[PDB]
Ligand binder design. Structure first.
Ligand SMILES: [Ca+2]
Ligand code: NA
Length: 1036
């Protein structure tokens, strides 16, 4: 070990190999020394006790017992650190010179971990032989572990090839080098194990499963206990082990030196070793190994004293004194070694993509191809490319589309249509096959009569190319996004309303409102401003976190209630910090524009500081008046322009009048409407200027009356002809000005700032409609020949969807407050507004696990058992009985009912397995991180009682009735291409070929073989134990 030479100089010789230590640091008993690179002579580095870490103008520094700033190399608390010799600023993640040699100080704590061969600033990279290399100032290849322009980097010693996206062992230390070759230290490896007689007795009794616990799929974990050959009873007397003897693996074996060091120091601090001896990353391994064997003595004495091991379970594996457990304190066994986050880690810290390993035959897969623009989002990502999962998705769809029949023999209690949740995150083949189901079951492709009985929609725009190719479902129009530019912002922050003249998705036209006199041209679409998520969840989220301090995905009912109070107070004020401006105007656009199906959001009409439908919003009357006027008056062609005062003027002509010169039928006279919208609350007209609405040739010399007028304090609303009136001239033009018409207040145009309008809003309809005029157009049975399921025409436009929930509804405190009970009770209210399609929330039982917003407010999107729609105990919305009664009531009130189909993910599956994992982002793209690729313990097995009962149960019958669904099939779809030069995305026609699928394999419970991946779980890169020297996993 430590030995003096002839002259009394101290030198060090490794305790196992006998190799002299030179140019390195060694801890010996209590002291840490450096041994010079020349003669190997010792220099004692004094232990710094007392003193504290601080800051300076902001840079961390370290001050001694009496407050002096320390400079240079320092031995602090059994670590070596380096502080700039001028500023005293601590170095972290870089090199410093000592003894004219370079040492690296890791980025986490600034601890000295290694020697670096050289530091380079003046050479240059080259490409040779298909590799990247680095040439120094003399144009000579650089080799080994070096720093280049301040980055730690590694060039293969033999070739000079730079290493990228790999973990590399250099001189006994393990590093990761990223996609640019930029490195980071991970851990110091253990040299080699004791081979004394003591160690031979710690060896495992055998390799059988019964010798180890906390195993998964035959692999060992950090939590594993094992049966040794022998037990040092009470620390003194070796005996053969029995089948009742188990000891933690981590009392005898460590994955790296950091963990062994931390282990000895932890056991020190908890009374199982007392010694002046310091244990550091510079300790001789021989001493560390012996120290661990000595801790065993003290462990065995305490096991004899306490007649058991429960104290040791707690000591190593539970939180003690509000600290993480010993295991969880270790880098390789915690989230720090998973490198969470990144721009592609949209939720939950990001994702782990599953792959294959020869040692994991039960979780391997031949599939896992995303087959769409996106892959991961949340929780356990379902592999919807897998043929067995595709069959299961058809099973579940059929279940939902026959839920009343299936569960109660009630054929009037089944869902009619679907929303495809997270459509761009699931494989195109399952989307195409889903649309074939609906074609097979309901003949939607035969005519609008059938298609319009089953109006489905997806959560995407024009990028949902499987949905647009044959318009099997509505895509979302660009109105929301356009309105967010020009209407929803505070004064001074809106763009001009000219962006509302065309509805355009990344440069592609969905529909043009300017002079729309045609049909069957627009892409069938739905228009919204808000939804349960969109435009909402992160604004409430901010009132919550602001009033409370909680995070937007995880809070208590009490903190939520508080945030909602602030939220609604803000909503009802003119000056809004959290809430959207101009909401009634935007609804006016939605509810009068041609060539769309509008969707009403529940939360724009009702407030979540009340139970379902209890508290009307400030906008409620305006939206009711607009839905009422839509049903009575809205039909025919559209025109739209923005005048010289910035006012948007939108006219609908009435039934059968497509252009401004058409006369239509006798019905036309009393149909049509005009809308004037401004976004300038300071608008003032001069005395001579006019604002005109050109109502058209069917509306000459005609009396109009208001639906909506802008007032000082809000909006005046009128649902009858008893309203202020105005007259068209002999050309059909209504004329407004800065003066009132016939002394009628609020008939003049002027900008206004108030809680319901920030700019100007007026809606005018012809006087004289009969009490139940209905300007809607019925669907016909005429056959389609163009290949499209939905067609954007007067009949499709006559539909109206209601999204009948909000995330932030409170839990019901009584049966009568339950959402689904209240919906059934109020079914005629929806009919009277003209709702034709009732979009219910996802009805699946919430996992309740608080791992995301959806599983904290229990909205139905985060579930374990996708067949459990409220059996035994209710969901947030009611029981399975309450659901059937709701669907019944809606149907008897002439509405279709939408099932929110969530194929993307499953939450909270308790059964564990082991699968190969790499970090990935939403796109399914591998991230270059330190975690690399590791076997990983996943929470991947489960489902629930209803998945067990129903999954796969319908497949044999479905293959008999609709055999085509189980065949392979060629199909086309549109594919969104993004341009290099920053010009608009463009669409190309892709071909797909879905596989044949089986009907005889059920997914009764989920497992990893059927998943693409999972959100990161925080277990670490090395929770599944292996030999880090050679990468070999332990396996029973
Ligand atoms: Ca997915
Ligand atoms: Na050694």
């Amino acid at each position: 070990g430590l030995r003096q030479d002839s002259n009394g100089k101290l030198r060090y010789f490794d305790l196992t190999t006998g190799i002299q230590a030179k140019g390195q640091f060694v801890t010996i008993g209590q002291e840490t020394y450096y041994f010079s690179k020349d003669h190997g002579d010792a220099q004692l580095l004094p232990m710094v006790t007392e003193g504290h870490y601080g800051t300076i103008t902001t840079a961390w520094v370290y001050r001694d017992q009496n407050n002096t700033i320390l400079k240079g190399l320092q031995n602090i608390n059994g670590t070596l650190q380096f502080f700039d010799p001028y500023t005293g600023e601590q170095l972290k993640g870089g090199v410093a010179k000592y003894d004219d040699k370079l040492f690296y100080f890791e980025s986490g704590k600034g601890n000295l971990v290694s020697t670096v061969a050289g530091d380079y600033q003046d050479g240059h990279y080259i490409s040779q032989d298909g590799q990247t290399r680095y040439a120094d100032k003399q144009n000579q290849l650089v080799k080994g572990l070096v720093t280049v322009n301040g980055a730690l980097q590694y060039f293969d010693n033999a070739t000079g090839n730079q290493i990228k996206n790999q973990q590399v062992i250099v001189d006994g230390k393990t590093y990761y080098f990223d996609d640019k070759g930029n490195g980071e230290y991970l851990f110091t490896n253990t040299l080699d194990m004791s081979t004394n007689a003591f160690s031979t007795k710690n060896v495992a009794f055998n390799h059988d499963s019964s010798s180890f616990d906390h195993t998964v799929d035959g692999f060992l974990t950090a939590d594993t206990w094992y049966r040794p050959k022998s037990i040092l009873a009470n620390g003194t007397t070796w005996r053969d082990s029995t089948d009742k003897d188990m000891r933690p693996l981590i009392t005898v074996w460590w994955p790296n030196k950091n963990v062994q060091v931390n282990y000895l120091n932890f056991m020190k601090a908890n009374g199982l070793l007392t010694t002046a001896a310091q244990y550091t990353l510079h300790s001789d391994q021989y001493d560390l190994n012996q120290a661990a064997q000595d801790v065993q003595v003290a462990i065995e004495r305490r096991i004899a004293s306490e007649h058991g091991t429960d104290w040791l379970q707690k000591l190593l594996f539970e939180s003690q004194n509000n600290n993480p457990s010993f295991v969880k304190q270790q880098f390789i066994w915690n989230k720090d070694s998973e490198y969470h986050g990144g721009g592609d880690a949209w939720f939950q810290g990001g994702y782990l993509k599953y792959g294959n390993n020869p040692l994991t035959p039960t979780t391997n897969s031949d599939y896992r191809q995303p087959g769409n623009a996106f892959d991961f989002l949340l929780a356990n990502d379902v592999d919807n490319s897998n043929p067995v999962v595709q069959a299961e998705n058809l099973n579940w769809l059929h279940y939902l589309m026959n839920f009343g029949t299936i569960t109660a023999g009630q054929d009037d209690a089944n869902f009619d249509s679907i929303r495809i949740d997270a459509v761009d995150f699931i494989h195109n083949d399952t989307i195409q096959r889903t649309y074939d189901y609906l074609r097979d079951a309901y003949q939607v492709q035969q005519s609008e009569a059938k298609a319009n009985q089953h109006i489905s929609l997806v959560e995407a725009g024009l990028d949902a190319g499987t949905s647009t190719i044959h318009n099997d479902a509505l895509i979302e129009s660009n109105l929301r996004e356009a309105a967010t530019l020009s209407l929803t912002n505070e004064p001074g922050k809106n763009k001009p309303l000219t962006n509302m003249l065309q509805d355009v998705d990344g440069g592609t036209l969905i529909t043009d409102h300017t002079q729309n006199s045609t049909e069957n041209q627009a892409t069938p679409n739905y228009s919204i401003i808000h939804a349960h998520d969109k435009g909402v969840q992160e604004k409430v989220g901010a009132a919550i976190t602001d009033a409370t301090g909680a995070d937007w995905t995880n809070f208590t009912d009490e903190q939520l209630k508080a945030g909602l109070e602030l939220f609604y107070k803000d909503q009802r004020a003119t000056n809004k910090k959290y809430n959207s401006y101009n909401i009634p105007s935007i609804y006016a656009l939605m509810l009068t524009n041609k060539d769309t199906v509008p969707r009403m959001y529940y939360g724009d009409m009702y407030q979540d500081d009340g139970q379902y439908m209890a508290n009307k919003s400030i906008y409620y009357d305006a939206l009711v008046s607009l839905m009422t006027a839509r049903k009575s008056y809205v039909s025919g062609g559209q025109t739209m322009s923005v005048d010289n005062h910035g006012l948007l003027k939108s006219v609908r002509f009435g039934k059968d009048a497509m252009t401004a010169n058409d006369l239509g039928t006798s019905a036309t006279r009393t149909e049509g409407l005009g809308v004037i919208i401004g976004n300038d609350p300071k608008l003032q007209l001069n005395d001579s200027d006019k604002v005109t609405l050109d109502m058209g040739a069917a509306h000459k010399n005609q009396k109009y009356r208001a639906v909506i007028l802008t007032t000082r304090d809000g909006l005046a609303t009128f649902n009858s002809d008893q309203a202020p009136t105005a007259w068209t001239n002999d050309q059909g033009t209504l004329t407004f000005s800065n003066q009132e018409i016939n002394g009628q207040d609020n008939t003049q145009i002027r900008g206004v700032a108030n809680p319901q309008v920030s700019g100007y809003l007026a809606v005018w309809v012809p006087v004289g409609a009969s009490d139940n005029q209905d300007a809607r157009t019925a669907a016909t049975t005429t056959e389609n020949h163009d290949g499209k399921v939905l067609h954007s025409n007067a009949a499709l436009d006559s539909n109206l969807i209601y999204e009948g929930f909000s995330n932030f509804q409170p839990k019901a405190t009584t049966h009568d407050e339950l959402t689904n009970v209240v919906i059934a009770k109020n079914a005629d209210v929806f009919n009277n507004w003209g709702i034709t399609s009732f979009e219910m929330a996802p009805q699946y039982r919430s996992s309740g696990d608080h791992t995301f917003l959806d599983s904290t407010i229990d909205n139905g999107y985060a579930f374990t058992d996708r067949y459990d729609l409220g059996f035994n105990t209710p969901t947030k919305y009611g029981t399975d009985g309450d659901l059937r009664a709701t669907i019944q009531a809606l149907h008897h009130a002439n509405m279709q009912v939408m099932a929110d189909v969530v194929d993307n993910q499953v939450y909270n599956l308790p059964g564990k397995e082991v699968v190969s994992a790499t970090r990935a982002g939403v796109y399914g793209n591998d991230d270059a991180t330190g975690f690399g690729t590791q076997l990983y313990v996943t929470n991947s097995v489960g489902g629930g009682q209803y998945q067990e009962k129903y999954a796969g149960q319908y497949l044999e019958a479905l293959k008999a009735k609709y055999p085509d669904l189980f065949e392979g099939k060629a199909y086309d779809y549109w594919y969104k291409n993004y341009a290099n030069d920053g010009s608009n995305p463009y669409y190309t026609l892709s071909h797909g070929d879905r596989e044949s699928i089986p009907a005889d394999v059920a997914i009764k419970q989920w497992s990893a073989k059927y998943m693409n991946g999972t959100n990161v779980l925080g277990n670490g890169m090395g929770y599944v134990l292996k030999d880090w020297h050679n990468g070999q996993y332990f396996k029973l």
